[PDB]
Amino acid sequence: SHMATLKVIGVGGGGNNAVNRMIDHGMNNVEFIAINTDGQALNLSKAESKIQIGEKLTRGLGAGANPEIGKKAAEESREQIEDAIQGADMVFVTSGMGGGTGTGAAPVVAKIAKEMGALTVGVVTRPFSFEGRKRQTQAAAGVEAMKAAVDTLIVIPNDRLLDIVDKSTPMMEAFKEADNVLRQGVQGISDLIAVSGEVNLNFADVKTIMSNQGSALMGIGVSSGENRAVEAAKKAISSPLLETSIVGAQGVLMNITGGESLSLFEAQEAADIVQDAADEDVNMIFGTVINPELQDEIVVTVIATGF
Ligand SMILES: Nc1nc2c(ncn2[C@@H]2O[C@H](COP(=O)(O)OP(=O)(O)O)[C@@H](O)[C@H]2O)c(=O)[nH]1
């Protein structure tokens, strides 16, 4: 076939939560896998594929906050993990850094995926500041292990969630907003992989921009009316949740989707917004897709790397 296989793997409590919320929202052409030391949380997982790691180590009661326990559980379940991953051309590993299962096992899962040739993308959170300095330091070590294990890594500091809520936004909704990064990135990459464009981008272009690239920005912006293209681009590159800014980006995959009214001029304006915002000359892998069922709506998908 010529259709890449995409899998999303949630490791630990936060990653399993992300998996479950993405499933609830509705995702179609992606295989979800849940990996955990916590048997109860895994029994509540909506993922079609489930891997309880560290069963003898932990008896399904969790790894605690020893990254080494989660790491050992993952390494001891390597074969199960590999069998679950087999067939994947692209693998998204999502996890909450700080704990023992995510922080320790997500890099092992990512390394396993990377050594099977899958384009391996990490989307991990850092703990809130109020969780303390030891938690944040452990999260940092986990983030560096992730960087060493993945093709590219998106970090979402939980503190940024305090910048998008008002005083009454339910925690559930804010966590759904954090998960939207991963979900909308997966959906955009999927659509781009699948849909032929007037300037065509395929999976190999995604690899070009994301293979062995370290830190990354992943964003999407939708807009309508006058100045829609510029505004969608600005939305795409200006997410308050992402640690990495677009500045200093050396590579960028950029796709623009619109109706049949999509003008070359406004696509140029969007690409200029992105190319200038980097404050650098950026290797842009650029694409355009005409979705005739859109009308006055323009969607700008951006993936930046090279920091
Ligand atoms: N955004 C978000 N962050 C989470 C969620 N659950 C946990 N976290 C964060 O991830 C860290 C690790 O928690 P968790 O994944 O449950 O620990 P582990 O499963 O033992 O590795 C926590 O300290 C939180 O900062 C979630 O549902 N959403």
Residue numbers in the entry: 9 to 315
Publication passage describing the model:
FtsZ is an assembling GTPase that plays a key role during bacterial cell division. This widely conserved protein polymerizes in the presence of GTP and metal cations into polar filaments that gather at the center of dividing cells to form a dynamic Z-ring. First, GTP hydrolysis only occurs within the filament, as the complete catalytic site is formed at the interface between adjacent FtsZ monomers. We report a dozen filament structures of the FtsZ core (residues 12 to 316) from the pathogen S. aureus, hereafter SaFtsZ, in complex with various GTP mimetics and metal ions.
